[PDB]
């Protein structure tokens, strides 16, 4: 019943992996006129999206294959890349960063509960819904060195086996990027960047609060097993940190906390 011609294309939202993502309008059904995003993959990701149900992870609405293509219909996230906020702000105040990192952490917990690893928390991959809340959305295939590797754990870069700990590293890299204006370890070229990540000689800016510095130091560690969040408490361990002292969690999850930016 549901099929590719139930939607008209409005614009291209992005290429990536081996697919296109369109903003579309549904023209049939009760949801006639309702707006969505549609990822078209030219014949995994669908399984992850089917399994998840979290306020901070994107909703899969319809999925189907017809012809060669595989079609995933996802909620439209008019809020945009979190990346665009950071780009305009230059550097987030810790209040701002804390909000986003707090929501991302609950999403990360949910995924790890399902045995899912996100690998790469680059801010271009974090989307915002219309209210300005966090949505993890891209669980596609793209392949490790194809894009930027600056938010990835060293044990991912030198393929030596890894688990959910890589995600807490990436949270720290992102946090560093939010607070300083660039990711922790940047080379002049590719090879020099990689080496800098492996050596993991962390440079804490003197201006960050003690809480902000201590969380960064516990997240960005070469030894995966000893990262905050690498332990059995996973996201709870991280959410416990005094950097997240003002975070009413039950309300954050309920999306009753107001985001630092309303894309509007
Ligand atoms: Mn690739």
mmCIF file of C-alpha atoms in Angstrom, residues 5-263:
data_model
loop_
_atom_site.group_PDB
_atom_site.id
_atom_site.type_symbol
_atom_site.label_atom_id
_atom_site.label_comp_id
_atom_site.label_asym_id
_atom_site.label_seq_id
_atom_site.Cartn_x
_atom_site.Cartn_y
_atom_site.Cartn_z
ATOM 1 C CA UNK A 5 4.782 7.622 -5.341
ATOM 2 C CA UNK A 6 3.004 8.268 -2.050
ATOM 3 C CA UNK A 7 5.607 11.046 -1.704
ATOM 4 C CA UNK A 8 6.685 13.983 -3.775
ATOM 5 C CA UNK A 9 10.219 15.326 -3.545
ATOM 6 C CA UNK A 10 10.642 18.805 -2.144
ATOM 7 C CA UNK A 11 14.396 19.246 -1.955
ATOM 8 C CA UNK A 12 17.590 17.267 -1.397
ATOM 9 C CA UNK A 13 18.668 17.343 2.274
ATOM 10 C CA UNK A 14 21.931 15.490 1.760
ATOM 11 C CA UNK A 15 23.939 12.786 0.029
ATOM 12 C CA UNK A 16 25.981 10.350 2.074
ATOM 13 C CA UNK A 17 26.690 6.666 2.368
ATOM 14 C CA UNK A 18 25.523 5.504 -1.024
ATOM 15 C CA UNK A 19 22.186 7.298 -0.795
ATOM 16 C CA UNK A 20 20.219 10.522 -1.056
ATOM 17 C CA UNK A 21 18.042 12.040 1.639
ATOM 18 C CA UNK A 22 15.121 14.123 0.463
ATOM 19 C CA UNK A 23 12.635 16.331 2.216
ATOM 20 C CA UNK A 24 9.297 14.977 0.969
ATOM 21 C CA UNK A 25 5.557 15.543 1.191
ATOM 22 C CA UNK A 26 3.204 12.612 1.645
ATOM 23 C CA UNK A 27 0.216 12.935 -0.680
ATOM 24 C CA UNK A 28 -1.828 9.839 0.215
ATOM 25 C CA UNK A 29 -3.404 8.663 3.448
ATOM 26 C CA UNK A 30 -4.405 10.217 6.751
ATOM 27 C CA UNK A 31 -0.996 11.934 6.802
ATOM 28 C CA UNK A 32 -1.640 13.643 3.468
ATOM 29 C CA UNK A 33 0.355 16.870 3.374
ATOM 30 C CA UNK A 34 2.558 15.777 6.238
ATOM 31 C CA UNK A 35 6.279 16.413 5.755
ATOM 32 C CA UNK A 36 9.035 13.806 6.145
ATOM 33 C CA UNK A 37 12.618 12.990 5.283
ATOM 34 C CA UNK A 38 13.262 10.088 2.894
ATOM 35 C CA UNK A 39 16.547 8.261 2.496
ATOM 36 C CA UNK A 40 16.968 6.435 -0.786
ATOM 37 C CA UNK A 41 19.682 3.816 -0.880
ATOM 38 C CA UNK A 42 20.655 2.217 -4.191
ATOM 39 C CA UNK A 43 20.796 -1.546 -3.553
ATOM 40 C CA UNK A 44 21.696 -2.852 8.987
ATOM 41 C CA UNK A 45 20.755 0.825 9.222
ATOM 42 C CA UNK A 46 17.054 0.025 8.885
ATOM 43 C CA UNK A 47 17.389 -2.582 11.609
ATOM 44 C CA UNK A 48 18.874 -0.083 14.050
ATOM 45 C CA UNK A 49 16.202 2.477 13.211
ATOM 46 C CA UNK A 50 13.466 -0.128 13.530
ATOM 47 C CA UNK A 51 14.704 -1.231 16.959
ATOM 48 C CA UNK A 52 15.054 2.200 18.545
ATOM 49 C CA UNK A 53 12.513 4.301 20.395
ATOM 50 C CA UNK A 54 13.982 7.340 22.122
ATOM 51 C CA UNK A 55 13.117 11.059 22.242
ATOM 52 C CA UNK A 56 16.684 11.835 21.190
ATOM 53 C CA UNK A 57 16.840 9.392 18.299
ATOM 54 C CA UNK A 58 15.138 9.918 14.944
ATOM 55 C CA UNK A 59 11.819 8.180 14.282
ATOM 56 C CA UNK A 60 11.485 5.686 11.464
ATOM 57 C CA UNK A 61 7.972 5.981 10.042
ATOM 58 C CA UNK A 62 7.824 3.776 6.937
ATOM 59 C CA UNK A 63 10.365 1.462 5.339
ATOM 60 C CA UNK A 64 10.065 -0.374 2.028
ATOM 61 C CA UNK A 65 11.948 -1.636 -1.001
ATOM 62 C CA UNK A 66 10.770 -1.259 -4.572
ATOM 63 C CA UNK A 67 12.784 -1.530 -7.725
ATOM 64 C CA UNK A 68 16.404 -1.578 -6.680
ATOM 65 C CA UNK A 69 16.186 1.284 -4.197
ATOM 66 C CA UNK A 70 15.517 0.903 -0.471
ATOM 67 C CA UNK A 71 13.353 3.660 1.046
ATOM 68 C CA UNK A 72 13.440 4.807 4.665
ATOM 69 C CA UNK A 73 10.845 7.393 5.699
ATOM 70 C CA UNK A 74 12.010 9.373 8.722
ATOM 71 C CA UNK A 75 10.667 12.331 10.669
ATOM 72 C CA UNK A 76 11.615 15.715 9.270
ATOM 73 C CA UNK A 77 14.084 17.444 11.552
ATOM 74 C CA UNK A 78 13.704 21.096 10.612
ATOM 75 C CA UNK A 79 16.174 22.078 13.323
ATOM 76 C CA UNK A 80 19.217 21.244 11.217
ATOM 77 C CA UNK A 81 22.745 20.068 12.046
ATOM 78 C CA UNK A 82 23.935 20.906 15.544
ATOM 79 C CA UNK A 83 27.009 21.770 13.526
ATOM 80 C CA UNK A 84 25.370 24.921 12.222
ATOM 81 C CA UNK A 85 24.806 26.237 15.739
ATOM 82 C CA UNK A 86 28.430 25.711 16.716
ATOM 83 C CA UNK A 87 29.594 27.315 13.488
ATOM 84 C CA UNK A 88 27.576 30.475 14.154
ATOM 85 C CA UNK A 89 28.374 30.635 17.896
ATOM 86 C CA UNK A 90 32.086 29.906 17.524
ATOM 87 C CA UNK A 91 32.212 28.567 21.087
ATOM 88 C CA UNK A 92 29.362 27.365 23.327
ATOM 89 C CA UNK A 93 28.981 28.536 26.897
ATOM 90 C CA UNK A 94 29.160 25.540 29.203
ATOM 91 C CA UNK A 95 25.425 25.797 29.887
ATOM 92 C CA UNK A 96 24.727 25.402 26.162
ATOM 93 C CA UNK A 97 27.205 22.539 25.711
ATOM 94 C CA UNK A 98 25.939 20.816 28.814
ATOM 95 C CA UNK A 99 22.361 20.721 27.503
ATOM 96 C CA UNK A 100 23.349 19.064 24.213
ATOM 97 C CA UNK A 101 25.884 16.684 25.775
ATOM 98 C CA UNK A 102 23.300 15.680 28.392
ATOM 99 C CA UNK A 103 20.683 14.775 25.737
ATOM 100 C CA UNK A 104 23.277 13.029 23.603
ATOM 101 C CA UNK A 105 24.293 10.976 26.656
ATOM 102 C CA UNK A 106 20.781 9.625 27.235
ATOM 103 C CA UNK A 107 20.602 8.694 23.552
ATOM 104 C CA UNK A 108 23.999 6.996 23.870
ATOM 105 C CA UNK A 109 22.772 5.056 26.891
ATOM 106 C CA UNK A 110 19.681 3.845 25.041
ATOM 107 C CA UNK A 111 21.788 2.658 22.095
ATOM 108 C CA UNK A 112 24.310 0.855 24.298
ATOM 109 C CA UNK A 113 21.424 -0.843 26.100
ATOM 110 C CA UNK A 114 20.499 -2.172 22.655
ATOM 111 C CA UNK A 115 24.092 -3.111 21.918
ATOM 112 C CA UNK A 116 24.474 -0.248 19.459
ATOM 113 C CA UNK A 117 27.646 1.800 18.977
ATOM 114 C CA UNK A 118 27.494 5.193 17.273
ATOM 115 C CA UNK A 119 31.263 5.606 16.696
ATOM 116 C CA UNK A 120 31.255 9.204 15.451
ATOM 117 C CA UNK A 121 29.718 12.186 17.279
ATOM 118 C CA UNK A 122 30.939 14.843 14.845
ATOM 119 C CA UNK A 123 28.478 17.794 15.131
ATOM 120 C CA UNK A 124 27.536 17.485 11.431
ATOM 121 C CA UNK A 125 25.924 14.134 12.420
ATOM 122 C CA UNK A 126 23.936 15.505 15.336
ATOM 123 C CA UNK A 127 20.526 16.766 14.136
ATOM 124 C CA UNK A 128 18.035 18.996 15.966
ATOM 125 C CA UNK A 129 14.260 18.598 15.878
ATOM 126 C CA UNK A 130 11.983 21.644 15.376
ATOM 127 C CA UNK A 131 12.158 22.498 19.128
ATOM 128 C CA UNK A 132 15.957 22.343 19.176
ATOM 129 C CA UNK A 133 16.336 18.981 20.932
ATOM 130 C CA UNK A 134 18.969 16.394 19.934
ATOM 131 C CA UNK A 135 18.382 13.631 17.390
ATOM 132 C CA UNK A 136 20.926 10.988 16.470
ATOM 133 C CA UNK A 137 19.900 10.072 12.960
ATOM 134 C CA UNK A 138 22.748 8.758 10.840
ATOM 135 C CA UNK A 139 23.505 5.097 11.459
ATOM 136 C CA UNK A 140 24.480 4.571 7.830
ATOM 137 C CA UNK A 141 27.634 2.957 6.464
ATOM 138 C CA UNK A 142 29.415 6.152 5.450
ATOM 139 C CA UNK A 143 34.646 3.171 5.607
ATOM 140 C CA UNK A 144 36.501 4.403 8.704
ATOM 141 C CA UNK A 145 38.868 6.913 7.078
ATOM 142 C CA UNK A 146 36.566 8.317 4.396
ATOM 143 C CA UNK A 147 35.522 11.382 6.354
ATOM 144 C CA UNK A 148 37.064 13.303 9.235
ATOM 145 C CA UNK A 149 38.465 11.084 11.986
ATOM 146 C CA UNK A 150 38.873 13.815 14.583
ATOM 147 C CA UNK A 151 35.979 12.635 16.740
ATOM 148 C CA UNK A 152 36.866 8.950 16.657
ATOM 149 C CA UNK A 153 38.573 6.880 19.353
ATOM 150 C CA UNK A 154 42.179 5.756 18.712
ATOM 151 C CA UNK A 155 41.283 2.078 19.062
ATOM 152 C CA UNK A 156 38.934 2.632 16.122
ATOM 153 C CA UNK A 157 41.655 4.305 14.067
ATOM 154 C CA UNK A 158 44.141 1.491 14.637
ATOM 155 C CA UNK A 159 41.688 -1.356 14.174
ATOM 156 C CA UNK A 160 42.330 -3.278 17.370
ATOM 157 C CA UNK A 161 38.878 -4.067 18.693
ATOM 158 C CA UNK A 162 36.607 -1.700 20.580
ATOM 159 C CA UNK A 163 33.257 -1.334 22.298
ATOM 160 C CA UNK A 164 30.815 1.294 23.525
ATOM 161 C CA UNK A 165 33.729 3.139 25.166
ATOM 162 C CA UNK A 166 34.536 4.666 21.786
ATOM 163 C CA UNK A 167 31.299 6.610 22.114
ATOM 164 C CA UNK A 168 32.333 8.272 25.349
ATOM 165 C CA UNK A 169 35.606 9.324 23.753
ATOM 166 C CA UNK A 170 33.628 10.831 20.909
ATOM 167 C CA UNK A 171 31.396 12.648 23.418
ATOM 168 C CA UNK A 172 34.569 14.142 24.892
ATOM 169 C CA UNK A 173 35.934 15.117 21.502
ATOM 170 C CA UNK A 174 32.623 16.820 20.675
ATOM 171 C CA UNK A 175 32.552 18.491 24.090
ATOM 172 C CA UNK A 176 36.077 19.743 23.499
ATOM 173 C CA UNK A 177 34.990 21.057 20.097
ATOM 174 C CA UNK A 178 32.001 22.843 21.672
ATOM 175 C CA UNK A 179 34.064 24.521 24.339
ATOM 176 C CA UNK A 180 37.257 25.379 22.436
ATOM 177 C CA UNK A 181 36.157 25.759 18.860
ATOM 178 C CA UNK A 182 38.026 22.764 17.467
ATOM 179 C CA UNK A 183 38.330 19.006 18.145
ATOM 180 C CA UNK A 184 41.029 17.829 20.643
ATOM 181 C CA UNK A 185 43.647 16.569 18.182
ATOM 182 C CA UNK A 186 44.218 18.273 14.837
ATOM 183 C CA UNK A 187 47.160 17.663 12.545
ATOM 184 C CA UNK A 188 48.522 19.647 9.622
ATOM 185 C CA UNK A 189 47.728 16.624 7.465
ATOM 186 C CA UNK A 190 45.941 13.295 7.829
ATOM 187 C CA UNK A 191 48.836 11.218 9.148
ATOM 188 C CA UNK A 192 49.820 13.887 11.662
ATOM 189 C CA UNK A 193 46.210 14.053 12.916
ATOM 190 C CA UNK A 194 46.037 10.318 13.507
ATOM 191 C CA UNK A 195 49.337 10.253 15.398
ATOM 192 C CA UNK A 196 48.146 13.091 17.625
ATOM 193 C CA UNK A 197 45.028 11.101 18.569
ATOM 194 C CA UNK A 198 47.007 7.932 19.418
ATOM 195 C CA UNK A 199 49.482 9.869 21.571
ATOM 196 C CA UNK A 200 46.423 11.480 23.201
ATOM 197 C CA UNK A 201 48.334 14.323 24.852
ATOM 198 C CA UNK A 202 45.348 16.252 26.108
ATOM 199 C CA UNK A 203 45.501 20.053 26.289
ATOM 200 C CA UNK A 204 42.950 21.366 28.788
ATOM 201 C CA UNK A 205 42.240 25.059 28.206
ATOM 202 C CA UNK A 206 42.820 26.961 31.482
ATOM 203 C CA UNK A 207 39.559 28.860 31.206
ATOM 204 C CA UNK A 208 37.131 25.954 31.402
ATOM 205 C CA UNK A 209 35.552 25.265 34.785
ATOM 206 C CA UNK A 210 37.110 22.604 36.981
ATOM 207 C CA UNK A 211 34.084 20.421 36.343
ATOM 208 C CA UNK A 212 34.370 20.858 32.585
ATOM 209 C CA UNK A 213 38.096 20.076 32.705
ATOM 210 C CA UNK A 214 37.662 16.958 34.855
ATOM 211 C CA UNK A 215 34.989 15.442 32.589
ATOM 212 C CA UNK A 216 37.110 16.112 29.509
ATOM 213 C CA UNK A 217 40.087 14.468 31.178
ATOM 214 C CA UNK A 218 38.091 11.380 32.082
ATOM 215 C CA UNK A 219 36.488 11.085 28.618
ATOM 216 C CA UNK A 220 39.495 11.686 26.357
ATOM 217 C CA UNK A 221 41.758 8.833 27.500
ATOM 218 C CA UNK A 222 43.851 6.492 25.374
ATOM 219 C CA UNK A 223 42.955 3.571 27.662
ATOM 220 C CA UNK A 224 39.360 2.755 26.725
ATOM 221 C CA UNK A 225 38.507 0.571 29.710
ATOM 222 C CA UNK A 226 39.300 3.421 32.096
ATOM 223 C CA UNK A 227 37.091 6.099 30.474
ATOM 224 C CA UNK A 228 34.101 7.491 32.327
ATOM 225 C CA UNK A 229 31.178 5.551 30.846
ATOM 226 C CA UNK A 230 33.349 2.593 29.914
ATOM 227 C CA UNK A 231 32.213 1.027 33.179
ATOM 228 C CA UNK A 232 29.000 -0.934 33.901
ATOM 229 C CA UNK A 233 27.070 2.235 34.741
ATOM 230 C CA UNK A 234 27.650 3.417 31.163
ATOM 231 C CA UNK A 235 25.723 6.669 30.671
ATOM 232 C CA UNK A 236 24.780 6.892 34.337
ATOM 233 C CA UNK A 237 28.468 7.097 35.255
ATOM 234 C CA UNK A 238 28.782 10.038 32.868
ATOM 235 C CA UNK A 239 25.529 11.705 33.865
ATOM 236 C CA UNK A 240 26.670 11.434 37.496
ATOM 237 C CA UNK A 241 29.634 13.732 36.856
ATOM 238 C CA UNK A 242 29.340 17.134 38.583
ATOM 239 C CA UNK A 243 29.528 18.810 35.192
ATOM 240 C CA UNK A 244 25.910 17.620 34.878
ATOM 241 C CA UNK A 245 24.833 18.865 38.318
ATOM 242 C CA UNK A 246 22.110 21.237 37.161
ATOM 243 C CA UNK A 247 20.550 18.639 34.871
ATOM 244 C CA UNK A 248 17.120 17.490 35.939
ATOM 245 C CA UNK A 249 17.202 14.301 33.910
ATOM 246 C CA UNK A 250 13.581 13.174 34.160
ATOM 247 C CA UNK A 251 12.577 16.554 32.716
ATOM 248 C CA UNK A 252 15.324 16.639 30.100
ATOM 249 C CA UNK A 253 14.085 13.297 28.814
ATOM 250 C CA UNK A 254 10.513 14.642 28.838
ATOM 251 C CA UNK A 255 11.866 17.492 26.718
ATOM 252 C CA UNK A 256 10.571 19.966 29.274
ATOM 253 C CA UNK A 257 13.966 21.638 29.478
ATOM 254 C CA UNK A 258 14.335 24.549 27.054
ATOM 255 C CA UNK A 259 17.086 24.229 24.419
ATOM 256 C CA UNK A 260 19.682 27.035 24.212
ATOM 257 C CA UNK A 261 18.590 27.666 20.636
ATOM 258 C CA UNK A 262 15.240 27.517 18.841
ATOM 259 C CA UNK A 263 15.948 27.221 15.108
#
